Amino acid sequence: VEMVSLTIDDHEISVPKGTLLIRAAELMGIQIPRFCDHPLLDPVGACRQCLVEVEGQRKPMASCTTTVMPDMVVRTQFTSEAADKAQRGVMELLLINHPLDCPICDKGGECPLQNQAMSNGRPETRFEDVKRTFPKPISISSQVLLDRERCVLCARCTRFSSQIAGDPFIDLMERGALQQVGIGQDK
Amino acid sequence: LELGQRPDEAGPPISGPATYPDDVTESLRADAEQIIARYPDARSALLPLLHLVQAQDGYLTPAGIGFCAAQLGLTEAEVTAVATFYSMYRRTPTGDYLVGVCTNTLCAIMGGDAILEALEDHLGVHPGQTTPDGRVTLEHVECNAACDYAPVVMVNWEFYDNQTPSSARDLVDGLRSGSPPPPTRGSLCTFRETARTLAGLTDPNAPGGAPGAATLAGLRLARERGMTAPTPP
Amino acid sequence: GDEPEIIAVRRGMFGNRDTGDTSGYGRLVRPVALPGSTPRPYGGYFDAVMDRLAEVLGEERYAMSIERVVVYRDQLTIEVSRVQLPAVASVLRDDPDLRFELCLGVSGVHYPEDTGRELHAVYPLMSITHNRRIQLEVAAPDADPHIPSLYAVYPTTDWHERETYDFFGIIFDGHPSLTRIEMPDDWEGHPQRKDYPLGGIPVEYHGAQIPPPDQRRSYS
Amino acid sequence: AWACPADAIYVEGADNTADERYSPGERYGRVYQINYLRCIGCGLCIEACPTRALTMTTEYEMADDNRADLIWGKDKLLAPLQEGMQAPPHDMAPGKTDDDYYLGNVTP
Amino acid sequence: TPLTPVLSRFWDEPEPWTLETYRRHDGYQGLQRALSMGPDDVIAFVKDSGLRGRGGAGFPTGTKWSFIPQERGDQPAGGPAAKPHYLVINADESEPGTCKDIPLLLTTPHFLVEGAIIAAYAIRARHAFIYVRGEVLPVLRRLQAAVAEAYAAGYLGTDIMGSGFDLDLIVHAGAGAYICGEETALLDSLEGRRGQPRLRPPFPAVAGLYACPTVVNNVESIASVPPIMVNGVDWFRSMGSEKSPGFTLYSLSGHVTRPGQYEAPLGITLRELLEYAGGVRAGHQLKFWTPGGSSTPLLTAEHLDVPLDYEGMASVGSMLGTKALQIFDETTCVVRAVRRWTQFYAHESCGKCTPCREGTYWLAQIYARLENGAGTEADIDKLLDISDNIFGKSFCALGDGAASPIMSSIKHFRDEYVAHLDGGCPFDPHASTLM
Ligand SMILES: Cc1cc2nc3c(=O)[nH]c(=O)nc-3n(C[C@H](O)[C@H](O)[C@H](O)COP(=O)(O)O)c2cc1C
């Protein structure tokens, strides 16, 4: 198997060719925030939470979509102010419309959003405007309730229901800020 | 159970008749075979099919979503994802004429916002709503690549250039009651006819479509100034 | 040595000790390393203390005895190799320039994931004359939990070697009588070892009970 | 209960169905027990509450000959129904929402 | 520089859209010239022509065509069988101010048809698609009629001009979505999916339509291909500059007398175009303008002499874009226009990525508060920081385009932005209603 050397932050490691930057950071012990990335799902690069700074790239690169290449130099939020600013701005944008539901949320305590907002988010809000709202919760089946306001539209659910299980009965619907995971009709 | 979106939600969710009659489905399948035949991949026809069903009814319905899903082998909630994504796929009964005032920045401040306000006060109907007569559905549209003609008002996606509040009021009055004033660029036809046209099932040899003043402005200036057209080889 | 001392390997985001609540976040692998060897220019009087200790101890003896030097949060720890502990303790207590007469005790800490070095004994020493202080760290494997007892050098370590034994099983070879001091002599196990269960009972409630915290889910 | 060092609080949430609503919002604590033989009075619980639903009064006289009797349930802990209040199983104040309750914009 | 009409030359004639009129002016002669040359010959011809993309990208068309793998000579085995090549002509035109393509398609669709045939031959694509937005139904009808006429006249189908080339051209009427104009969202919509941009790589040149090699070109570049196949390359290079050769349409619109489409060489400064148009609306002065569509940073009078070419606008910090040239005068509030553009971007965001989806919503609300009396001094800083957090972080360039008006308007008119804090917009909208 082909192996490519690489430098994340100041440290250097070698990983199999085709590895994603987020996976290399995981193996090296660097915790890059991530919502849409999933090891078993094909990368989508939607949430933009996993941005890192890559030498020779003007824009921040979504580590969940950037395949490792030889001699590439990557600086995460731990060693790049630009990367940290990008990640924290993405977190802030991720939280502006989020409901103040942590006490009543079932995911509370086990929420990746809570943890990654603590570790990579602003201490307090700048958002003094009106939050986007949906009727909550809505049942998409006898078993699964959906709270569209808490949805970060990471598409992990839809990407699973399409790639892993061949049952795409949920999909992202509407457009823009109104976009929401849904079943379309009574089905 | 109450599955899916609540009916009273913003951006009206797909609703209406659950299924089409046998004859309606027969005609729809007859058209859909022709639509499918023209693409390397069947699913490529999903957008035209959504237009086709949007012609059978005045708007996208669960019946149309189901028809498209069955035709393309897709599931509902896969067709719905595409359907709800595009604006032209209206989701409430559309009147005989969709009057959309371009309220994008340019057209808006060139007068478009005033046009929209005047029409709202005239028809007494908010954008996106249909007149009680069911003949006009007022809406506001984003830029329609007719900026040089600003303000521009679309009627079933046919242009009306340089519209002033009085001109637009007269236009909507004509559309609602009687004769539809001719589009400045385009041949006006009912919403269903335009929906079928978008499906590619209407004769493309429609009348109208003269270049108009703005499109010629540059050529007219070049002639009036006797400007060297270009650089003869 | 000279490498970071990993006491535990933590894998998965959010400090999950097991598979994890949300799929796809468990692939991180972050070793939990304690602070490693400090670069030589130690801060404050630590430089003087270490220079004096290396002068009193022969270069060979110093290299054999001092396994590591750490300066963390402006506190000096000296990883002293087992066996050599009494010699360096005597040097520290007796050397006029070191004169660490006050040994504050012995603390046991268990690192079940630290191969060959599971049990650490910490000796906080203070020199009143020089108004200095340091800590010694002596590691021992779980298989041979033996350390040289400092009873001759620091009698105050008596009962401490006992408490640390009672709670960890470190044998402190040479102690005058290493008998359990806290737990009953018939007690089985060493409570403060991480493998020893907390030994709580469920909290009783009307129609329900809460298991002890060691049984319930936690994140670290 | 999460913050209690002594595991002295047991709480079970449930949905505020429109037929029977006990608190604003989606969830209410239908079972709430404090084992006062495990309570250490630290006050971490009240510091933990995001709604001020839990306070600590100055009342202290409390003792029983029975272990079970000192596990105080929701009925024993609920504050007395004051003047202007209504039975808990009722709909929210007209033209009010959970945010209004938390912002303090509700009245008898 | 002279206002060079090439594509516009037919216009003002009776029924210029017909195939007969197009032929009357060397129509489809360029296609014959193309077929006389090899497909790689055509690719090199266009590359030497230096025809840069006419959408927002501005990338060289010749190189883009060359990127398609075509197994030229190298055909080791038929088992791989290659994959079909697809030419998609991006007839979508939804960038605010971008109204150059719709008039061209409505008046002389045969320019685009001939260019598309030439390009498909160049990249050896047996199928071509015209993706045209559905809100220009007259353009859809004109384009369908032109394609039908080309089919009847033997320009399409199989054995075009007995050259052995085969091409079936399909006009796809896309529904309403600005984002669909972006490639890999154009392809996603054309495949029957949500018009959301794809993750790149793989790029359309290898994994385009139906996961096959594909090239997406704006209608302007395609329509400019035939005029360069005739008249040669040197003629095209005789306009513009070395780094921006050729001619382009400029969509003068807004507070300008005699607005319309002006076909001019690249690099013509806005001053010349205004002079040709008769200057800004009489009785007012230029306040600001968009060189390209709203996606491009705003420019003011200080840049009125900058050449309208990719290099110049890059040197000024803007992008040439689609040459939308939206013009606004003293009567217009920059905050008002930028709020409307932000509303457009929020309405048009595909919603895929957090930065654009959420930041456009937040910015629209902030601008709504600014135009009203609810503005705050920290609101300007929040606008700038949010725009920074969107620009460069969003998945596609739509987020950058949404941020661009905000950043540019702030940089040029922080004074006006602050003035809005004093109780709202001072400007009277009626003053700008263009009568
Ligand atoms: C949000 C967005 C919208 C776009 N809209 C269009 C469009 O309407 N027309 C267009 O030709 N290009 C548009 N583009 C640019 C395309 O990505 C692509 O570069 C172009 O269609 C073809 O390139 P060419 O002009 O060099 O042939 C858009 C890009 C973005 C990011």
Ligand code: SF4
């Ligand atoms: S519902 Fe789906 S898209 Fe929304 S946050 Fe959960 S996994 Fe992501």
Ligand code: SF4
């Ligand atoms: S005072 Fe409250 S938090 Fe503290 S132990 Fe008692 S019940 Fe728990």
Ligand code: SF4
């Ligand atoms: S920036 Fe992101 S959310 Fe906005 S249109 Fe592009 S992909 Fe969609």
Ligand code: FES
């Ligand atoms: S996790 Fe990579 S962009 Fe979302």
Ligand code: FES
């Ligand atoms: S702004 Fe109205 S058509 Fe473009």
Ligand SMILES: [Zn+2]
């Ligand atoms: Zn204003």
